[PDB]
Amino acid sequence: HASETLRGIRTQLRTLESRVRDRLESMLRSSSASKMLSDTIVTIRNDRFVIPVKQEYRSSYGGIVHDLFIEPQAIVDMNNSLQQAKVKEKQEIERILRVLTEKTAEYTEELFLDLQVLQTLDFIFAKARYAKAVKATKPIMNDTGFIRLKKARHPLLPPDQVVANDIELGRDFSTIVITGPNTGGKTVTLKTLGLLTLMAQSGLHIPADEGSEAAVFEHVFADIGDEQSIEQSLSTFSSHMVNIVGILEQVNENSLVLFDELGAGTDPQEGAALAMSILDDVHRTNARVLATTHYPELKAYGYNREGVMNASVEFDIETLSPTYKLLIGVPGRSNA
Amino acid sequence: MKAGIHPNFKKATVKCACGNEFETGSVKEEVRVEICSECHPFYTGRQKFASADGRVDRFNKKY
């Protein structure tokens, strides 16, 4: 149905092949000729139908010896016509492929616009399938630099292993200092606030409950590092200090800043003094700050400064285990 | 199958140097090989080395 020429070539091929088979069969049912053959059956050599032939019978035949195997002279013309029909076939197919190229060339704008529409829809629908797949809510997303992660969860933990915490920042206070011994909830609270902020600022739903709010920061800053390897505790203090210097050069009122154990890896009094002075420097920019510390001196910090709030992580002395529950407004006590 | 006149047939995992694994009932419990079907170039279609070196001479008129 592509072209009448292609239909005629298909008819020529099938009729010429049928004439080949009928001519071979008329040779093969001839009783006088059956003596000269190896077999009364068709065979193929070199992309041709051929007769199988007795080697001693050679000079009796009218045909091309392939191998005996012989292509009879009356069928050479038929096979040549079939070859010309294959040439006409591939010419027809290349012509039709050029016509299809033209018909695609006519609808270029439609194909590109449909491709853009479907890539937009696949992007939108994949985001929404992810948002349903982690059972997550739309954050109420604001220019006021304000956060309220209701019952917030660390996204990288299992939903049954994680502990849910209310985190609120950037309304009554711009800075929170989480105080207390190095219990595994301090750093996890920092990473939770940071992860959920980057998720939310990308329009990906967060593991926090309905009516949660999150902030449209112009920048996010982090000094969250592992104390890697005791061959390098001053490479840790120095690495933190180099990162802190880089944060202090760039921070503004539209920034989130996350600080893990400010001034760690040195003398605790100098570390606490550095930490207070760095927090005061950043706090004056009206940046949103979450900091952790084990330093006792920083337990007084959020009582003595307007716009700062103290927090701690709850610890069970009866089990010797962290509860990972954040207590906002309560400074951490030591239990050593 | 006569009794005891023939050796015991055992399923073996024919191995190749290229990693191809073939299984055939053989006398040996295992058969290590270097060139399997796919490893041999003829089975790889137009082999790269052969298809590259099979060019005809050009009289060496480069110089």
Partner: protein, 176 residues
């Protein structure tokens, strides 16, 4: 297995649809594979008959037969009843395993294998060879190999024409 399922699921249906057969079992089938050794060199080496008999038992567990001269000849110093060559008939899982081993190792193991003979179709629909090397595939124990004369293999099929047999062999994997 590894060959029976492949055949029944790819070669039979495809070939049936290609050749437009009027029945299911009209598809040509490989009935058997006969392996022969041919040698009357036994005249000069009486122990040569033992050769290719211990090798054939390892090639295929089926013990060969000590075929004997059906007619005497003076040109070859032969007398009727003297042993000449060996015969083996593989029918069943044995022939499938032999085909698998062959295709997988023997042909690719040959150094100068390229475009096997197309000629050696019977006309009738069978396919016929005389491997000239006695150590073609690994079960021949190169170390224990002393003589170098290979084997006759004769593939027999129910094909009524050479064309359909060629198609069957090519679809099976015969690298023509």
């Amino acid at each position: 297995n590894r060959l029976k399922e492949k055949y029944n699921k790819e070669i039979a249906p495809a070939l049936m649809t290609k050749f437009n057969y009027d029945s299911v079992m009209q598809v040509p089938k490989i009935e058997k594979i006969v392996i022969n050794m041919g040698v009357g060199d036994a005249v000069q080496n009486a122990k040569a008959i033992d050769s290719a008999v211990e090798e054939l038992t390892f090639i295929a567990g089926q013990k060969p037969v000590v075929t004997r001269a059906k007619k005497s000849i003076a040109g070859f110093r032969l007398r009727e009843g003297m042993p000449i060559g060996a015969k083996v008939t593989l029918r069943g899982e044995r022939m499938y395993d032999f085909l698998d081993k062959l295709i997988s190792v023997s042909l690719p193991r040959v150094r100068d294998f390229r475009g096997v003979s197309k000629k050696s179709f019977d006309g009738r629909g069978n396919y016929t060879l005389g491997i000239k090397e006695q150590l073609i595939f690994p079960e021949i124990d190169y170390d224990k190999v002393t003589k170098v004369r290979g084997m006759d293999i004769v593939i027999v099929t129910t094909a009524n024409t050479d064309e359909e047999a060629r198609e069957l062999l090519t679809q099976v994997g015969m690298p023509f």
